[PDB]
Symmetry: D2
Subunit: 382 residues, 4 copies
């Protein structure tokens, strides 16, 4: 990384060590929205990491970005979650947005004055998006939106929502009917309920209801209707990389606590790491985490070099997310009974890890996508 | 075969779980509310007397029946099985090792649940390395004077008899011959100090205990001789490991049932999700492992009951079932997709409860050590 | 088990200890057909374990049967393989055969004078049997058979082959066109080639070619054409149980060698089992093997009690077969470098284990079948 | 970035594998035939001089290039990478620790393959517990007199220089300071006793060595001082672990390629088998793990080359890649169904070769022990 990029990663690490870690336990326990921490994140530039001049201060490299996201997640997964969707919307705007849209939204998004999130998932399905029921019917110079979404993260605090919806529910082929609309908080758009979650606490995830919600037709992302799927798929290069960084972040936290505790707790006359059963866990955890970060960093470099990286980003997400779950459980084992205590942090990492497996696209879907990609590519890029 | 009465008790407990436990468990468990009404119904059912024969109680069910009762309870809510586990182990220790006076003093009120008991072994400085324990009981006239501390003691507040493993001779040679078990009532100097906040196993309290100059009569000693605490506990761990294995198969049954049901209710891409191989494969693996774990458990319970050696088999049951329940709990979350993460669904609770049987009822690392040594002592499996 | 059944299991165990184990290494290495050992197996009654009076001495209980098969496999998997298909054909004859067929074949099968095997698999597919190309066209009082099978075990030494084939390739629905024929070694039926295998050595597995091979129409198993699938599916209750017993057998052998070696080999001043890394493997191996046998024995009892046991038999096969593979590799680990030497037996168990995973129906298919069964049943039988 | 010449060498080795190795490997490997022609072509290519710089040889490639060459070789046939592994490690030990005389005596003929070297550490009594080794070298005038035995020594017959770890002072205090490495030629008393029959790694011999009153000059000592054998070997194990990791990723690449190709050629139930999720999922998991393992390997190779600490990272690469190759090899067998079991297909060979990198190049149990200790010494990962 360049010195400027190294400095950014260090500022975030120091932010996590000095500001996040002292307060996270109490806030996460009470499901308190971390306003002060988020505000500091806006000040250091977290909400503009993908936004270049003239709209923002500059788009850091993807290797820098994943390190930032990892550092945040290592302190508290929810903080990285607070900017994940926002970064994806940023990227979608840059790739596909009109000049007017980019100009309208990107400058305030970069400071975090305006936050954005992604609304794809419907109550009837998050995987089978083609079956979605949310429609956007053209009426004069407006779309009239009727439907619902759920599990939408940061939905209350985000005043721009990238809504995947059916601009033509009767299109043939059906993919021509699906678009992305950039939807502000207009009448008829209700953020109807906060959903109670195992982990990812502090950040709200919500049901959305649209009852004849009118938005200008200029809300369309890009010039053409029916590009929503192709657009999303490109968005997922960044999405999958950030989720993977979230997972290596949670894994780092759990591994660090486990390794530290194994030196401080003794049994049968020695530090517990010197029992092979515990040392073996530490060796496996560290080795898999090194593999996971190595893969992540490799995928990020491919992204940065402008090479095809869609499969690689997916593999990063699959591997890191499964790895973080394994590491989290083993960190609990290393603490013995104290692993089960809410006065230690490992139980929280254990609660947080599944989010990246089931709640950021599923890993079953991710495997299906990787298999298709392997066949298309003919193997790994070696 | 289970006797008539034994089949009936299992059914009664299943019905209690379906009609009384399941409709209130979310609210109680989420609020960490002590389930006083549910536990009282368990007392009436006879749950606290399952190992207590006549003349003290209304009959000791077979071990295969006992594990099925524990499994049914845990299927509804792991914590309700936890409520009676240590009590059962103490019941057994009294029968195996107690004087006639002790058995008569405690077992009749234990069988009804009027008196509850728990086991206190774990110290803040270690639950595995018990030889290093600091709790001491020193003879002074016809009392023991107890000083020290224990922690993670389940049901310590609601239990008014505690089987306390402590050093009656800290200078013993060999050192393991200095450890005994005392049956300690709630005497002056015995403080039940605080409820420890936990990931799961909610509703049931686990506590730190502090003993300051706590006087009990020397008749509190379990058995006639000091220095047999470890031997006695080993024998108690046969019951303990089987009951923990049953907790784990019960939690597994609950997670698996929910996942299988959900996989038929939820559809994607035009069909019930079980018909996608990625999901159907998880169900097949879950169901297959669960069948393996219950088969192992029931085999070990029958060996216990046939009077055959079952110490290794009980540890195997605990190890296999607890690891299996954790695997099944996670996969049940996966089957639910995003809803697996919601506390309005039950699979997140099983996921939070499953690690308890792995790290908090003796650890699985210690359990493998014990099994390796037993395999060598035995020369392999009993075949 | 009854005393008679205990005695049978003991006779086989003693046969394995006294006769098999001294010679297996040299024979298996050279792919030598174990004629003497097979002949002894005929003499002790292995080929009539499922054949009742009046045709044979008696059908042992399924719990007895799985213990016999396990004992054989523990000495050498190939020996249990030599009687597996034969037992299934025995069972198919008893369940579905005419009185004439049963009388013709079962008495000689019970002594092993006549051996039988199952021929389902085609070169084009062993899983997708409905797509099979082998046809049996009626011409007068004969079927004329044209096609091919492959991976047919014991095909040279078996003079009766239960051939799944299409008696009506145009049937609608297509399952009405599939039958089982009991085919003797007639002209036009070539056992064309022996296939070289990783393990399962000593026993031949062959390609079969049928070129206008004529058999009497009385060769049909049962009175009706188009019952082949339903018949096979019933045959697989016994098939899956025997394969599961083969796996627990190989697992017992590998575990026993590993446990023994861990007491006899020392490093850093002590027997290697006392290193937790090795002890942990032994504990896991023993525990999983106990689970596997417990499940197997439970499924066998259900079979014997006449309760539905099809899912259970499949679960037994899946679990035991995966377990034996895991145990075999770990037995190799326990031996260190000597695990890799062909002068020790663990490499052979390692080569043999995959057979039960890929070569006795696949475990992927087995999982699909179990999922369907779980949905049909509504869960486990508890 | 790889230099021009470095990219070219990798391509040359890939082409050699595709055109020369693959068409003959089955017949040779099945017959345990020493691949003399293939190895001779490897000599001409420069394979035996990859770590030997000027003035001794035509240049030491970077470590990232080296691992890619080793991986390409192993992809074709694990045994061909094995043929040059120990030779590379000895090359490095000579460069790090040898006198000018030793370097000049051996490295020029080593670089061409005219002289081959191997490492002899493992004893019949143990390959892990090397401190317990029985091979001794006792000074007598200006000779060492060597007595003892080694086993599993790869390429012992074809290699005419053996780096022998032995006790120059069996009474040393501390005991580890009695162990040295001697560069031993094929002298009277040094018997290469027999080729050990193996599950895989065929074509290349592994042998028992027996030393009886075997005299070598004292100048055979690697370095100026006795008692540094363990320290020197640790340094050599950086190269050794990286090369073994590369063998494992190479074998994995071969198994994965075959499985992916087969999954497109074979159809069932109306489609290419990859389109059944059970198969596609295996491919996704295989490809994902392989990518992880190669990423880790290349990261560790770059650290080596940047002069950064890489001792833990090399062990991690070996552990992860070897376990990954075994998993991928089995799943490739599964993908082929029954044909996976046929010796007319190649996946059975990868399956037989993969355990070598787990149990026979230091064990993975020892490797985890080493990694745990390193993690503690370091305080975690280098991040
Ligand atoms: C909610 C709840 C409820 C209860 C309990 C726990 C919890 C969490 N337990 C306490 C429980 O039995 C205890 O946690 C375990 O004995 C493990 O103890 P430590 O936490 O001290 O692990 P400890 O500090 O011993 O071990 C930490 C880690 O090192 C490992 N380790 C330690 N020594 C080792 C060795 N020699 N070899 C290999 N690995 C080794 C452990 O396996 C673990 O991974 C208890 N107790 C009680 O007495 N009565 C009760 O009612 C309950 N109930
Ligand atoms: C806390 C939190 C936060 C968020 C989100 C979730 C959660 C829990 N998500 C929603 C998330 O992406 C969603 O849960 C997943 O897409 C999975 O969707 P379903 O729950 O609908 O699984 P679904 O019902 O699709 O699947 C259920 C199970 O079946 C499997 N399955 C389904 N179809 C299959 C197939 N064809 N093949 C194989 N297996 C198949 C799945 O893998 C899963 O195991 C979200 N969404 C969003 O739009 N914006 C957001 O901000 C967030 N944030
Ligand atoms: C084909 C082939 C080729 C070669 C070699 C092997 C093979 C099979 N090796 C030998 C190889 O390095 C050796 O096998 C390993 O060092 C393991 O040694 P043992 O077989 O003596 O295992 P050992 O007897 O040390 O161990 C047996 C089991 O116990 C475990 N164990 C032992 N001590 C332990 C501890 N303290 N803690 C935890 N677990 C422990 C091991 O991990 C293993 O599971 C070799 N050598 C050489 O010098 N030069 C060469 O060229 C080759 N090449
Ligand atoms: C040594 C030996 C001995 C015997 C046999 C094999 C071998 C190797 N078998 C044949 C064996 O039963 C056969 O190999 C299996 O049925 C698998 O068949 P294919 O190899 O055709 O796999 P196939 O080509 O069907 O499958 C290839 C891969 O795709 C997977 N797959 C295929 N369809 C799928 C689907 N719908 N969903 C998910 N995954 C799917 C498979 O699981 C496998 O991983 C046999 N047969 C016989 O009739 N008589 C005998 O005596 C013997 N004995």
């Amino acid at each position: 990384l360049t010195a400027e990029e190294e400095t950014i990663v260090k500022t975030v690490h120091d932010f996590v060590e000095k500001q996040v870690k002292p307060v996270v336990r109490e806030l996460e326990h009470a499901n308190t929205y971390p306003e002060e921490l988020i505000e500091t994140m806006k000040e250091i530039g977290i909400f503009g990491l993908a936004i270049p001049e003239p709209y923002g201060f500059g788009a850091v490299s993807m290797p820098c970005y994943v390190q930032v996201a990892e550092e945040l997640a290592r302190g508290w997964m929810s903080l990285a979650g607070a900017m994940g969707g926002h970064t994806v919307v940023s990227k979608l705007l840059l790739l596909f947005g009109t000049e007017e849209q980019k100009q309208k939204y990107l400058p305030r998004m970069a400071t975090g004055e305006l936050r954005a999130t992604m609304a794809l998932t419907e109550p009837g399905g998050g995987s089978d998006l083609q079956a979605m029921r949310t429609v956007a019917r053209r009426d004069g110079d407006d779309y009239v939106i009727n439907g619902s979404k759920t599990w939408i993260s940061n939905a209350r605090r985000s005043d721009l929502v990238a809504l995947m919806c059916k601009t033509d529910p009767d299109a043939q082929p059906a993919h021509k009917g699906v678009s992305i609309l950039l939807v502000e908080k207009v009448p008829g758009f209700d953020v109807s309920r906060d959903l109670p979650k195992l982990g990812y606490k502090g950040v709200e995830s919500c049901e959305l209801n649209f009852t004849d919600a009118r938005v200008p037709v200029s809300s369309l992302l890009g010039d053409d209707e029916g590009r929503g799927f192709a657009q999303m798929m490109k968005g997922l290069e960044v999405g999958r990389l950030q989720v993977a960084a979230r997972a290596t972040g949670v894994a780092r936290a759990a591994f660090e606590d486990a390794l530290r505790y194994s030196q401080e707790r003794e049994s049968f006359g020695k530090p517990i790491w010197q029992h092979q059963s515990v040392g073996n866990m530490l060796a496996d955890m560290g080795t898999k985490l090194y593999a996971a970060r190595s893969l992540l960093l490799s995928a990020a470099e491919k992204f940065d070099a402008g090479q095809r990286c869609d499969m690689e980003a997916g593999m990063a997400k699959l591997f890191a997310s499964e790895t973080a779950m394994q590491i989290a459980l083993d960190a609990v084992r290393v603490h013995g009974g104290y692993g089960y205590s809410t006065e230690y942090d490992v139980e929280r990492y254990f609660r947080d890890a599944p989010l990246m497996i089931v709640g950021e696209g599923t890993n079953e879907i991710q495997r299906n996508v990787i298999a298709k990609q392997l066949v298309a590519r003919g193997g790994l890029d070696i």
